[PDB]
Amino acid sequence: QHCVAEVLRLDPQSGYLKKLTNATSILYNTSLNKVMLKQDEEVARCHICAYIASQKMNEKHMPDLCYPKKAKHLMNLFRQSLSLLVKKYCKMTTEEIIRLCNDFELPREVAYKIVDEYNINASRLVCPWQLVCGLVLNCTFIVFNERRRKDPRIDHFIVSKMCSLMLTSKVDDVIECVKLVKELIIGEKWFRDLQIRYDDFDGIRYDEIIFRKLGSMLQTTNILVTDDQYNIWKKRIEMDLA
């Protein structure tokens, strides 16, 4: 029962779940009952069973159900028994850029938003690598501000990773791929929602930047350090005798 649910709830990666588990159980039962369906490694015996379970109950969705040689064989047997920017005019799909965005482990809402941006504004393009790269980089900078702040090393590591993934040694082009997309995507409401959510606003907080720019001297430029920093640092020399 554990593995059956493991594979069935792997489809995401009301009645659907219950009816699908029942269908898989009874289908596997029928396939193993007679001595007619043998030489079948259980390693993969819960995939097209799930496909036909989807086909049966009420509704069927072709995409991402077969997601290979023996797949068609088993289907028939069971159903009878029963650099990267110089390149010009490149093409892309949903899952290609989903992979490129998922190498960072970023959430799925951001990837879907980038995909929507692409499928809406991919008609007048010259190289989609630039737009997608800029989008994902400006998503990383906005969501990862906390760890970047506490560790200024990240900046170089992330840039090196996204310079090696696109197979280039020069990086000013990447800098352009960031700033141009920032210019282009600067005024959309979902971008606004992301900004208010992850509180970057150019890498500094709203309540500080307002006083930073309004013309005050109470603005907190943190050349000094926080009290908790000193409190936790004291321990390091507390044990200096060793």
């Binding site: 995401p12 990666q13 969705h61 995409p63 991402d64 997601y67 949903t94 899952e95 989903i98 965005c101 998922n102 960072f104 482990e105 970023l106 959430p107 799925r108 990837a111 879907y112 995909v115 929507d116 499928n119 809406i120 991919a122 990862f144 760890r147 090393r153 170089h156 590591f157 090196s160 990773k161």
Partner: protein, 42 residues
Amino acid sequence: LKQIIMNNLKEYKDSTSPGKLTLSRNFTPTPVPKNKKLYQTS
């Protein structure tokens, strides 16, 4: 710390392996969206 801190950055630059940097601890990977329809090519 001008003379030492640069040495600290240089030495610590070569240490970390790029492979094992886990940007998020408790993330679940992005699956394949089911339907092709919603991705209208306007």
